[PDB]
């Protein structure tokens, strides 16, 4: 499972179909042709938010990291939640897909393509005054049998989605060259 | 008239009320000629069946029998928690008569 601090409450998340990328109102919303790009996402920064722009929602591999990250971005916020999400192919390990071009390598994040459906969310810890209420509130709509078997998307499926611009050196070298889209590198 | 699986189940002979408070574990379904049935099992280690339709079953119970297999099929898929099962203990495996789910 993965974790992410967010100022958005459990009923706002249910109202949108899940944890949505910036601009995306809800999950199955086709009305906003949102720009999806892993590289552009990995380099961005939104105040009051852990990277959620460019068609991707970042998540951490641990609770202390999810919390560390929540304490920088959401410090003082009388209330925020730490969402426990299950692994599924719509997740991409940033460092692995971007290699030495991963903007914030020491960070280690597993970004999710298009957002995180509500059915993929395990539960959430409430965080008051910057202190974690240790009792996880579970999500009854979590599809355990479906998300129990799935795993993060392996790097060989994201290289083509790495999103580097055309002139980028990466596209001309390993391992990106083998999966470069038309017009790139 | 009855208002609970307990009240309804105490109106028959050879019936027991089992409390599971667990989701189904396994689901078996047979089109096998003469064994058209559904078998379910839980972790407690109990196996229950929906019996095959036959001439003893009034046309009314016929439709009720097909409904139960539908419920058990989608209850399994949804991983829905079963509360209690009224069953006829005079056949092995116990024959499902009623079922309740809660919350």
């Amino acid at each position: 499972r993965l974790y992410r601090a967010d100022s958005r409450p459990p009923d706002e998340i249910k109202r949108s179909g899940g944890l949505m990328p910036r601009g995306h109102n809800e999950y199955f919303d086709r009305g906003t042709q949102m720009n999806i790009n892993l590289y552009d996402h990995a380099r961005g920064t939104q105040t009051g938010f852990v990277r959620y722009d460019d068609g991707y929602v970042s998540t951490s591999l641990s609770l202390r990291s999810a919390h560390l990250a929540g304490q920088s971005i959401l410090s003082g916020y009388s209330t925020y939640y730490i969402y426990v999400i299950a692994t599924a192919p719509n997740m991409f390990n940033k460092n692995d897909v971007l290699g030495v071009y991963s903007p914030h390598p020491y960070e280690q994040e597993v970004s999710a393509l298009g957002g995180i459906p509500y059915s993929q969310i395990y539960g959430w810890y409430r965080v008051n005054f910057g202190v974690i209420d240790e009792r996880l509130h579970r999500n009854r709509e979590y599809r355990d049998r479906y998300y129990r078997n799935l795993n993060i998307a392996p790097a060989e499926d994201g290289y083509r989605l790495a999103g580097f611009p055309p002139d980028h050196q990466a596209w001309r070298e390993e391992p990106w060259i083998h999966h470069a889209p038309q017009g790139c590198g | 008239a009855p208002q609970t699986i307990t009240e309804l189940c105490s109106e028959y002979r050879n019936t027991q009320i089992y409390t599971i408070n667990d989701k189904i574990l396994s689901y078996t379904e047979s089109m096998a000629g003469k064994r058209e049935m559904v078998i379910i099992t839980f972790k407690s280690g109990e196996t229950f069946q929906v019996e095959v339709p036959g001439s003893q079953h009034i046309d009314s119970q016929k439709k009720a029998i097909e409904r139960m297999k539908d419920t058990l099929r989608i209850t399994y898929l949804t991983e829905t928690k079963i509360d209690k099962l009224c069953v006829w203990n005079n056949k092995t495996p116990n024959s499902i008569a009623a079922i309740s789910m809660k919350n």
Binding site: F28, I36, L113, P117, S119, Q120, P166 | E66, L77
Partner: protein, 41 residues
Amino acid sequence: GDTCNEETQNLSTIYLREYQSKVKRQIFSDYQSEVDIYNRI
């Protein structure tokens, strides 16, 4: 050229749209009520 950023946005979107169908196959199926085809015909 833009083909890159247009190809990127496109392989991404088709990756999205197909995953959004796995999810729909999970959740919308709860609502599927079977029919006794022999009953109505």
